[PDB]
Write an enzyme that holds these catalytic residues in place. Structure first.
Site, short mmCIF file in Angstrom:
data_model
loop_
_atom_site.label_atom_id
_atom_site.label_comp_id
_atom_site.label_asym_id
_atom_site.label_seq_id
_atom_site.Cartn_x
_atom_site.Cartn_y
_atom_site.Cartn_z
N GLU A 1 8.07 -7.14 8.69
CA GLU A 1 8.49 -6.54 7.40
C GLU A 1 9.76 -7.14 6.87
O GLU A 1 9.88 -7.35 5.67
CB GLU A 1 8.66 -4.99 7.50
CG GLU A 1 7.35 -4.21 7.62
CD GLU A 1 6.57 -4.12 6.37
OE1 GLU A 1 7.10 -4.50 5.35
OE2 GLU A 1 5.34 -3.74 6.47
N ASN B 1 8.20 -4.92 -5.99
CA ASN B 1 6.68 -4.89 -6.11
C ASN B 1 6.31 -4.97 -7.56
O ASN B 1 7.05 -4.71 -8.45
CB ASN B 1 6.13 -3.63 -5.39
CG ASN B 1 6.63 -3.45 -4.01
OD1 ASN B 1 7.13 -2.36 -3.63
ND2 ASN B 1 6.54 -4.44 -3.15
N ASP C 1 4.58 -3.01 -9.34
CA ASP C 1 4.73 -1.74 -10.02
C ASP C 1 6.14 -1.35 -10.36
O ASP C 1 6.27 -0.29 -10.98
CB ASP C 1 3.99 -0.62 -9.20
CG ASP C 1 4.66 -0.19 -7.90
OD1 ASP C 1 5.64 -0.74 -7.40
OD2 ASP C 1 4.11 0.67 -7.21
N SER D 1 8.48 -0.79 -8.11
CA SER D 1 9.15 -0.06 -6.92
C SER D 1 9.75 -1.20 -6.09
O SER D 1 9.37 -2.36 -6.34
CB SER D 1 8.20 0.78 -6.18
OG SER D 1 7.28 -0.17 -5.68
N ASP E 1 11.04 -2.36 -1.95
CA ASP E 1 11.03 -2.01 -0.47
C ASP E 1 12.38 -2.36 0.07
O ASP E 1 12.96 -3.39 -0.23
CB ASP E 1 9.94 -2.73 0.27
CG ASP E 1 8.60 -2.46 -0.31
OD1 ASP E 1 8.18 -1.37 -0.73
OD2 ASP E 1 7.88 -3.47 -0.45
N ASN F 1 9.70 2.05 0.70
CA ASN F 1 9.42 1.93 -0.72
C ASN F 1 10.00 3.00 -1.58
O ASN F 1 9.96 4.21 -1.24
CB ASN F 1 7.95 1.72 -0.88
CG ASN F 1 7.54 1.45 -2.30
OD1 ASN F 1 7.18 2.39 -3.00
ND2 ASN F 1 7.65 0.22 -2.72
N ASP G 1 2.99 11.42 7.99
CA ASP G 1 2.25 11.66 6.73
C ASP G 1 0.77 11.69 6.80
O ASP G 1 0.18 12.24 5.79
CB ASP G 1 2.77 10.60 5.69
CG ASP G 1 2.62 11.04 4.26
OD1 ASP G 1 3.03 12.21 3.93
OD2 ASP G 1 2.07 10.21 3.51
#
Length: 129
Positions: A35, A46, A48, A50, A52, A59, A101
């Site tokens: 990562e 990203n 969109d 957003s 990281d 994110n 989650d």
């Protein structure tokens, strides 16, 4: 901070990640490797809008506030900048909620694609733990 392999594994274990929600230490270290390359200051934007952050590339869409991700949640109740710190506590605490989650470590695409079903133990071989 750029962590060494064993160093990071030793901090992660202290922060209670070894076999957290059934994921051995080797999973987490492999995940951090792929990562962020063990760099706490890694950021990646990203499509969109957003971003990281840090060592586990958490994110801004859902987990932290960065003040530039318009319809996002701050589920970890922390400024995204706190995830870039040389002290992994915040990254580790937020990772613990993410993994809890429902989709496990699948939430990290480098884990899924490069760690998942591999010999993750190799990532801790040699370390004093």
């Amino acid at each position: 901070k750029v962590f060494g392999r064993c160093e990071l594994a030793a901090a992660m274990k202290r922060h209670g990640l070894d076999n957290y929600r059934g994921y051995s230490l080797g999973n987490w270290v492999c995940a951090a490797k792929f990562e962020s390359n063990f760099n706490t200051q890694a950021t990646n934007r990203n499509t969109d809008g957003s971003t990281d952050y840090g060592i586990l590339q958490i994110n801004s869409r859902w987990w932290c506030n960065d003040g530039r991700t318009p319809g996002s949640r701050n589920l970890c109740n922390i400024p995204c900048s706190a995830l870039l710190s040389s002290d992994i506590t915040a990254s580790v605490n937020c990772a613990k909620k993410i993994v809890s989650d429902g989709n496990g470590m699948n939430a990290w695409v480098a884990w899924r694609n490069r760690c998942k079903g591999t010999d993750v133990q190799a990532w801790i071989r040699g370390c004093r733990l």
